[PDB]
Amino acid sequence: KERERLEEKLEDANERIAELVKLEERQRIARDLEDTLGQKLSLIGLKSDLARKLIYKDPEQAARELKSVQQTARTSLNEVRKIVSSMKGIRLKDELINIKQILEAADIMFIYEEEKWPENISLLNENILSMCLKEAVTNVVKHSQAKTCRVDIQQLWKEVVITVSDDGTFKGEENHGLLGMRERLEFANGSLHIDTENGTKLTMAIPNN
Amino acid sequence: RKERERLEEKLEDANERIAELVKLEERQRIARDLEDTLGQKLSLIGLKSDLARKLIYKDPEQAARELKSVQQTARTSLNEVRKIVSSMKGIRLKDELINIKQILEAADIMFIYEEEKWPENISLLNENILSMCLKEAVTNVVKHSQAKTCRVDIQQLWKEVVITVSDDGTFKGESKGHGLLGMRERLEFANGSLHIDTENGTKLTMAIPN
Amino acid sequence: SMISIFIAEDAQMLLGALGSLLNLEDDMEVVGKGTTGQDAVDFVKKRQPDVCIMDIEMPGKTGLEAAEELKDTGCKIIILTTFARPGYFQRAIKAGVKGYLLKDSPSEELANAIRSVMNGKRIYAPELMEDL
Ligand SMILES: Nc1ncnc2c1ncn2[C@@H]1O[C@H](COP(=O)(O)OP(=O)(O)CP(=O)(O)O)[C@@H](O)[C@H]1O
Ligand SMILES: Nc1ncnc2c1ncn2[C@@H]1O[C@H](COP(=O)(O)OP(=O)(O)CP(=O)(O)O)[C@@H](O)[C@H]1O
Ligand SMILES: [Mg+2]
Ligand SMILES: [Mg+2]
Numbered sequence: 400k401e402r403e404r405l406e407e408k409l410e411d412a413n414e415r416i417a418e419l420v421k422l423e424e425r426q427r428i429a430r431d432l433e434d435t436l437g438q439k440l441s442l443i444g445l446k447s448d449l450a451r452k453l454i455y456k457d458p459e460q461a462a463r464e465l466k467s468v469q470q471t472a473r474t475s476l477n478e479v480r481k482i483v484s485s486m487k488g489i490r491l492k493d494e495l496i497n498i499k500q501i502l503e504a505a506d507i508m509f510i511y512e513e514e515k516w517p518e519n520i521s522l523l524n525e526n527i528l529s530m531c532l533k534e535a536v537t538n539v540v541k542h543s544q545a546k547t548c549r550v551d552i553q554q555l556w557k558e559v560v561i562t563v564s565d566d567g568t569f570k571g572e573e574n575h576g577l578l579g580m581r582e583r584l585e586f587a588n589g590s591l592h593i594d595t596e597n598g599t600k601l602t603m604a605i606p607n608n
Numbered sequence: 609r610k611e612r613e614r615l616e617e618k619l620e621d622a623n624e625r626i627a628e629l630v631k632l633e634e635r636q637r638i639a640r641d642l643e644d645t646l647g648q649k650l651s652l653i654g655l656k657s658d659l660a661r662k663l664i665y666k667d668p669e670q671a672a673r674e675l676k677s678v679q680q681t682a683r684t685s686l687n688e689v690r691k692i693v694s695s696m697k698g699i700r701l702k703d704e705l706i707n708i709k710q711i712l713e714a715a716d717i718m719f720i721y722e723e724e725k726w727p728e729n730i731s732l733l734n735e736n737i738l739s740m741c742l743k744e745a746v747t748n749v750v751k752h753s754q755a756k757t758c759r760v761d762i763q764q765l766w767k768e769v770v771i772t773v774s775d776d777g778t779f780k781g782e783s784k785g786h787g788l789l790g791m792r793e794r795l796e797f798a799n800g801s802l803h804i805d806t807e808n809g810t811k812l813t814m815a816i817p818n
Numbered sequence: 819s820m821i822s823i824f825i826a827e828d829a830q831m832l833l834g835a836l837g838s839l840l841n842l843e844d845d846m847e848v849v850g851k852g853t854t855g856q857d858a859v860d861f862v863k864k865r866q867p868d869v870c871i872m873d874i875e876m877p878g879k880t881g882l883e884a885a886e887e888l889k890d891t892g893c894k895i896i897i898l899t900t901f902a903r904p905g906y907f908q909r910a911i912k913a914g915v916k917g918y919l920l921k922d923s924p925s926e927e928l929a930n931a932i933r934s935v936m937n938g939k940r941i942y943a944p945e946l947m948e949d950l
C-alpha cells in the first residue's frame with residue numbers, strides 16, 4: 400500500500416527531527432561531563448604515571464601519589480553517582496509522597512491503597528507519569544474545592560493506569576496542564592481521559608511490558 | 609490578524625513539550641551507559657590503585673603493571689566521555705563562542721550574538737581557522753576599541769561561512785606578523801578573505817569556503 | 819581460622835583485582851571465582867565457603883537472585899554494587915545478606931566488614947540505605 404510507504408516517510412521525518420534534539424542534548428551533557436570529570440580523570444592518569452616512575456626511585460613518594468589517585472577516583476565516582484541520579488529524573492514512589500504532603504496541607508483527604516504496583520516501568524515512562532500525577536493533584540488542589548481525592552496506580556495488562564478522582568466540582572468549559580498531560584502521554588503511546596460529572600476523574604494510561 | 613500569532617505560540621509550546629521528552633529519553637539512555645562504563649572503570653581504578661599501593665614494597669614489578677592499567681583505564685574513560693558526543697562537527701567554533709562571551713563580559717563590553725545561527729557542515733580545519741580569527745577579532749576589540757558593545761554574526765551564505773565582528777568603539781590603527789595581517793594571510797591561504805570597515809567603530813568580515 | 823571466600827563478579831578486571839586484594843590478608847583465602855549468579859549457587863552448595871562476595875548485576879542470575887537461593891545455607895553473603903539502585907536494599911535484607919557494600923570501598927574497610935560478618939554482624943553501607 401501507499402499508506403505504508405508514506406507512513407515510512409513520516410516515521411523517518413520524525414526520526415530526523417528527533418535525532419537533532421537528541422544531539423543538541425548529547426552535546427550539552429558532553430560539555431558538563433568534560434567540565435567536571437575531565438580534569439579529575441586526567442589528573443588520575445598523570446599521578447598514576449608519575450607514581451609508576453617513582454616505584455623504585457622514591458617508593459614513599461609513589462605511595463603518596465597513589466593515596467591521592469585513590470581519593471580522586473573515589474570522589475569522582477561520587478560525582479558520577481550524583482549525576483546519574485539526577486539524569487534518571489523523578490521516581491513515582493517519590494511523587495506519591497509529594498502529593499500526600501500537598502493534599503494534607505490543602506486539607507483534602509487523600510485515599511490511596513497499593514494494589515497491583517507496576518513491576519518494571521521504564522525510567523522515561525515513570526518520569527512522565529510522575530509529571531502527570533503531580534499536575535492532576537495540583538489541579539485538584541487549585542480548582543476542585545474537593546474534600547477527598549482518590550489515587551489508584553495499577554499495572555493492568557500491558558499498561559500502567561493511574562486514576563485521580565475528586566469530590567469537588569469541575570470548573571472548565573466543554574473543551575496548560577490538561578493539554579500538556581494528554582500530549583505527553585500520547586507521545587508515549589498512552590492516553591488521558593476525563594469524567595466531569597461527579598467531580599473530576601482523570602484516567603491516564605501509559606504502555607509498560 | 610492576532611488570533612494567528614496567539615495560535616502559533618500554542619504550536620511552538622506543544623513542539624517544545626515533545627522536544628523536552630525526547631531530550632529526557634536521551635538523558636536516561638546516557639545515564640545507563642555512564643553507570644555501566646565510567647562507573648565500572650572508576651571502581652576498577654580505585655581498586656587497582658589500592659592493590660598497586662599494597663605491592664610497592666612486596667612486588668614493585670606487579671605494582672608497575674597495575675599502574676599501567678590504571679593509566680590506560682583513565683585515558684579510555686576520558687575518551688568514552690569524549691566519544692559520547694558522537695564525534696560532531698561544529699564543536700571547536702562552538703567552544704570559541706563560549707571563550708569570547710567570557711572575555712567580553714570580563715572586559716565589560718556587551719556581547720551581541722545568537723546561538724541559533726552556527727554552521728555545522730564546516731570542515732574541521734576551516735572551523736579551527738575561523739575559531740583562531742574569531743578569537744583574534746574579539747582580542748582586538750577588547751585591547752584597542754574601547755567599545756561598550758561588540759556584535760558577532762555567523763552566517764552560512766552560499767558556499768561560504770561568513771563571520772562579522774563589529775564594535776562601537778574607535779579604530780586606532782593607521783602590519784608584519786600581527787593579528788590583522790595574520791588573519792588575512794591564514795584566511796587567504798585557505799581560499800578565504802578578510803575585509804575591514806573603520807567608519808562606525810570597527811567591523812571585520814571574514815569568509816572561508818564551505 | 820582462615821576465612822574461605824568465593825567471589826562472584828562478571829567483570830574479570832574487578833574479579834581478579836578483588837581476589838588479589840583479598841589474598842593479601844593473613845586470615846583470608848579466595849577458594850573460588852565466578853562470573854554469574856549460578857556459579858555462586860553451584861560453588862556455595864558444593865564447597866560451602868564461609869563467605870560469598872556477590873556482585874548484583876551479572877548475566878544469567880543476578881547476585882540478589884543467587885542470594886535468595888542461598889538464604890538458608892550457612893554461607894554469609896556480602897553484596898557489592900557500584901550504584902545504590904532502588905529496591906536493591908530491600909531485596910538484600912529480605913534475602914538475608916550479611917553485608918551490602920560498595921565495590922569502590924577501600925580494601926581495609928572490605929576486610930573489616932568480612933571479619934564483622936564472620937562475627938555475626940550485618941554490615942550495610944549508609945549510602946546504600948535508600949533514606950540517605
Ligand atoms: N480537578 C479539577 N477540578 C476542577 N476543575 C478542574 C480540575 N482540573 C482542571 N480544572 C479546570 O480546568 C481548567 C484547565 O486546567 P489546566 O490544568 O489545563 O490549567 P490551570 O488553570 O490549572 C493552569 P496550569 O495548568 O498551567 O497550572 C482549570 O482552569 C479549571 O477550571
Ligand atoms: N577592534 C579594533 N578596534 C580598534 N582598533 C583596532 C581594532 N583592531 C585593531 N585595531 C588597531 O589596529 C592595530 C593593529 O592590530 P593587530 O591585531 O594587527 O595588532 P595588535 O596591536 O593587536 C598586537 P597582536 O595582534 O599581536 O595581539 C592595533 O594596534 C590597533 O591600533
Ligand atoms: Mg493546572
Ligand atoms: Mg591584535
Ligand SMILES: [Mg+2]
Nearest residue numbers: 828873875876
Ligand atoms: Mg556489574
